[PDB]
């Protein structure tokens, strides 16, 4: 009533004050500033490998940290570990539930994590004395499906779920240590900072939030999209990120200045982005649209400089190695592809 | 080739065995019939499972050397469009509606009742873009309570524009035609209907017939003869 009205009014005043103080710090767009350097030449990328063996739609993939091994997950119910240089298969892991949406691969190479549409995140151990891959742990405690999961180190994992909640877990105990709350709708994606002390998340209320792993508090809020947020990623510097909407638009948000930097869209694109990624020097922004092909934007001038057209269904996942050698794309036709 | 050493000619063999096991395990998942079950809460879903019993919930049974597998999504209550494209290649959708409950109104809101909310849900799931060629089996549940409930209250509370004598068969026909009308394709979709009840034992034959029909038409479509 009275207290509710006063709280709502003061919150609106603070929102207006935040918007004004964000408006005051802008003098020149990044476009005016970058009107000097010459454009990169048209990027001619061609397919080198093609990795086949999945019998259904592919939903996620993740590059290893030695830049030679990757993992992929499909609705078939299997999780496969490949070997890009020779195309061979190292491991094929059966699953107890085939409704997967997320896979992640440890930054040391011992564990993999999987999950989706079951409310449960599973941790598998790859290096055992018995010769097989066995399920190591089963983290339960969410209420909606699992949208993303990332390893923070070998014994700490952060997940995001479709009940407006992210959680940080100790794997050995099995229990949440911190819960991250404050969004309105389903949380769709998260990305970790290069130092792994911050991470951003993006949800279906057209907003993105900058958290804090230590203290478990939301520190900043970024808005401006007009629809869902399907993908997000940090700049290799760790001081900006790029958001991939569902209204056929990408955006670049700045951390220290907390303001929108530029917009990546074109008048022939009317279908939403399903994945974004960066280049090792932070110049090329790769975006995977669902008109069946990827697009390569020059991140300092917002100009297309190539097209990776080799798929015949929706592109669902996309990623660049840690040394910037190749890019991999997956798709709903059950094929992975690798580009130099 | 000859570029390979004695420890790169064993990784290739291991990969080939992985491949044959994957391909052999993809055959056992192509000779099962997958059904997606849907309903409006207190609408006989559990009872239908009981006649057919052996987050996501699973049922897995057998009938006449055919093997059915049934997915129940009641306890999700998330945003629907972010996971409804997962059930894209299901053979059929089993929709359970309760016609013995037309009078009672929503617990959340005394204004709107069971029937119109269920009709809206059916409309949403029928004209979806992922299910433009997936069939819908429609179970009308609890036909005992309808018999004893129709005598007191005329259905003009739920259907003001209907002219009837408030008897069983004409009201049941009116309900089924009102449900089958919401279909907007009429060409690449059919909506079967069956009046169920507690103590039936006959609610597996109907599903078997409907899925045999769907499979026959899929086969005709594949060879182009259709």
């Amino acid at each position, epitope marked *: 009533g009275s207290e509710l009205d006063q709280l709502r009014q003061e919150a609106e005043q603070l929102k207006n004050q935040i918007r004004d103080a964000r408006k005051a710090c802008a003098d020149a767009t990044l476009s005016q500033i970058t009107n000097n350097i010459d454009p990169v030449g048209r990027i001619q990328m061609r397919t080198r490998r093609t990795l086949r063996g999945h019998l259904a739609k592919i939903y996620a993939m993740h590059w290893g940290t030695d830049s030679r091994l990757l993992v992929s997950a499909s609705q078939d119910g299997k999780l496969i570990i490949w070997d890009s240089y020779t195309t061979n298969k190292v491991h094929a892991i059966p699953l107890r539930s085939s409704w997967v949406m997320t896979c992640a691969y440890a930054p040391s190479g011992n564990y993999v994590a999987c999950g989706g549409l079951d409310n449960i995140c599973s941790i598998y151990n790859l290096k055992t004395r018995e010769g097989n891959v066995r399920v190591s742990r089963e983290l339960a405690g969410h209420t909606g499906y699992l949208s993303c999961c990332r390893f923070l180190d070998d014994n700490q994992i952060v997940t995001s779920s479709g009940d407006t909640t992210c959680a940080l877990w100790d794997i050995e105990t099995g229990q949440q240590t911190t819960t991250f709350t404050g969004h309105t709708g389903d949380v769709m994606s998260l990305s970790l900072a290069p130092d792994t002390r911050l991470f951003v998340s993006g949800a279906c209320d057209a907003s993105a939030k900058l958290w804090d792993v230590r203290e478990g508090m939301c520190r900043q809020t970024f808005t401006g999209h007009e629809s869902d947020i399907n993908a997000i990623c940090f700049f290799p510097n760790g001081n900006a990120f790029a958001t991939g909407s569902d209204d056929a638009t990408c955006r670049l948000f700045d951390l220290r200045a907390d303001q929108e930097l530029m917009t990546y869209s074109h008048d022939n694109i009317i279908c939403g982005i399903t994945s974004v990624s960066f280049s090792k020097s932070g110049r090329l922004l790769l975006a995977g649209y669902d008109d069946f092909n990827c697009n390569v934007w020059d991140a300092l001038k917002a100009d297309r400089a190539g097209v990776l057209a080799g798929h015949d269904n929706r592109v669902s996942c996309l990623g660049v190695t840690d040394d910037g050698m190749a890019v991999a794309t997956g798709s709903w036709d059950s094929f992975l592809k690798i580009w130099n | 080739g000859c570029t390979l*050493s004695a420890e790169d000619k064993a990784a290739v063999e*291991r990969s080939k065995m992985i491949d044959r096991n994957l391909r052999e395990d993809g055959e056992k998942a192509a000779r099962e019939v997958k059904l997606l079950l849907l309903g409006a809460g207190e609408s006989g879903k559990n009872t239908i499972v009981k006649q057919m019993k052996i987050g996501i919930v699973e049922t897995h049974f057998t009938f006449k050397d055919l093997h059915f597998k049934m997915f129940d999504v009641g306890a999700q209550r998330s945003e629907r469009k972010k996971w409804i494209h997962c059930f894209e290649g299901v053979t059929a959708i089993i929709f359970c509606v309760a016609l013995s409950d037309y009078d009672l109104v929503l617990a959340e809101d005394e204004e709107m009742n069971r029937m119109h909310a269920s009709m809206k849900l059916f409309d949403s799931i029928c004209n979806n873009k992922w299910f433009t060629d997936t069939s819908i089996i429609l179970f009308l549940n609890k036909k005992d309570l309808f018999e004893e409930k129709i005598k007191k209250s005329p259905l003009t509370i739920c259907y003001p524009e209907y002219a009837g004598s408030n008897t069983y068969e004409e009201a049941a026909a009116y309900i089924q035609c009102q449900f089958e009308d919401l279909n907007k394709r009429k060409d690449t979709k059919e909506i079967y209907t069956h009046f169920t009840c507690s103590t039936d034992t006959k609610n597996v034959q109907f599903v078997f017939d409907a899925v045999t029909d769907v499979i026959i038409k899929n086969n005709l479509k594949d060879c182009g003869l259709f």
Partner: single-chain antibody
Amino acid sequence: VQLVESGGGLVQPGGSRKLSCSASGFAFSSFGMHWVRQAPEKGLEWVAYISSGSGTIYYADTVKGRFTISRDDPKNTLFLQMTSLRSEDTAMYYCVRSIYYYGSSPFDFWGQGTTLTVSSSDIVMTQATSSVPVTPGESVSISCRSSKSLLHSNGNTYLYWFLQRPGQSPQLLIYRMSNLASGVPDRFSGSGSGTAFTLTISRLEAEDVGVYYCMQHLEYPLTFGAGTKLEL
């Protein structure tokens, strides 16, 4: 994890016999398996190999046409059948696990051994020294040399160092050139180039006393360097 084989005994020069190993503890159906022999007061040499899935079988030129290797995969028991027993076939037989994929470590676990007495080209690896007296606390270096290059085009060089203590079966120490085996102290290190290789022990204790072997894995047959002992 364990491998227990049996079948040994004393047999006449004209005869045939069988050896069988029982494999309890691991996934026996995804592990290639070797048989390796060691003569009485002499080094040890490779005998046979059977793949995972019984696809490929390799033998030794000295033994081809007399030995048959087979599995029993449901029951986890692997057999070697010997049809002619010359008087120089007396040895002690070991059965060896090995798994190949990217990042593996073949020759991990090394059975327990079964004696057998009998009544009465190839890459050459050489170890120059035969005995190295030493005292605890000081480093030791052991040398292996080959007759041609082990550095393949792909980038790997297939050299293995492993140890045998008295009254005990051997165990992997180092794989490839510098990779350290599972559960060994970090005191051991190894390196080399081309056709020369050296193993170094920085510290020293009373458990390092024993014999050391260097082996190659470019092509079958697999050959073993002679035995070098290290005394206290």
